[PDB]
Amino acid sequence: RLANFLVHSSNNFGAILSSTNVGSNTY
Amino acid sequence: RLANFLVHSSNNFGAILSSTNVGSNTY
Amino acid sequence: RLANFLVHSSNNFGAILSSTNVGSNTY
Amino acid sequence: KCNTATCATQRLANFLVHSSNNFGAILSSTNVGSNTY
Amino acid sequence: KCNTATCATQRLANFLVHSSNNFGAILSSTNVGSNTY
Amino acid sequence: RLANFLVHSSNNFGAILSSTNVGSNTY
Amino acid sequence: KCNTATCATQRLANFLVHSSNNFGAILSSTNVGSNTY
Amino acid sequence: KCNTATCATQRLANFLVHSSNNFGAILSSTNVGSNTY
């Protein structure tokens, strides 16, 4: 009997600015 | 009987600016 | 009976600026 | 201006600005995960 | 201006600015994870 | 019966600026 | 200006600025994880 | 100006500035984890 319990929780109470640029030209 | 319990919790109460640039030209 | 308990918790109450540049030209 | 019994104010700002003023030539090429044979 | 009995103020700012003034030539090439044969 | 307990906790109450540049040109 | 009985103020600032003024030539090439045969 | 009995103030600043003024030629090449055959 194998039990696995995974919890991934993200709570944001604020400002997150995330920019991922892959192989991109930004001007 | 094998039990695994994984909790990943992220709480943000603030400003996170994350920029990942991979192979990118930024001007 | 093997039990593994992993907790990864990140709490931010502040400003995090993270920039990862891989192979990128920034001007 | 706060004169209340108690006031909590939070200003959180993330500013990302990319600004380019170009008076000339910019040449940009990006190859990512590219296989050339 | 705070004359409150008690006041909490937090200003959190992340500023990332990329600014380029170019009066000339910029040549940029990026190869990431690129296999050339 | 083997038990492993791992806790990784990060609390930030402040400003963290982290920049990792790998193979990148920054002007 | 704080004349409160008690006041807490936190200013947290992360400033990252990349500024380039170019009056000439910049040549930039990046190879990361690149296999050339 | 704090006239408060209690006025905890924290200013935390991280400043990272990359500034380049170029009046000439800059040549930059980066090879990371690159296998050349």
E36 phi and psi, to 5 degrees?
-115, 130
Q: How far is CA D32 from the centre of its chain?
A: 22
* Interchain pair H23, G24: CB under 8 A: yes
Provide the CA C8 distance to its chain's centre, in angstroms: 11
**Sequence letter at residue G16:** L
On whether the CB atoms of residues E12 and G12 are closer than 8 A, the answer is yes
**Cβ–Cβ contact A16 with E under 8 A:** no
d(CA C2, CA B8): 20
Q: Residue E16 is which amino acid?
A: L
For residues E34 and D33, the answer to whether their CB atoms sit within 8 Å is: yes
| Deposited experimental method | cryo-EM
Contacts of F23 in chain H (CB under 8 A): 30-33
Distance between CA atoms of residues D8 and E4, nearest Å: 11
Q: Please give the resolution of this entry in Å, rounded to 1 decimal.
A: 3.6
Residue of chain B whose alpha carbon sits nearest to that of D14: B17
Tell me the nearest-neighbour CA distance from G6 into chain F, angstroms.
Answer: 20
Task: Give the largest Cα separation in chain C, rounded.
Answer: 57
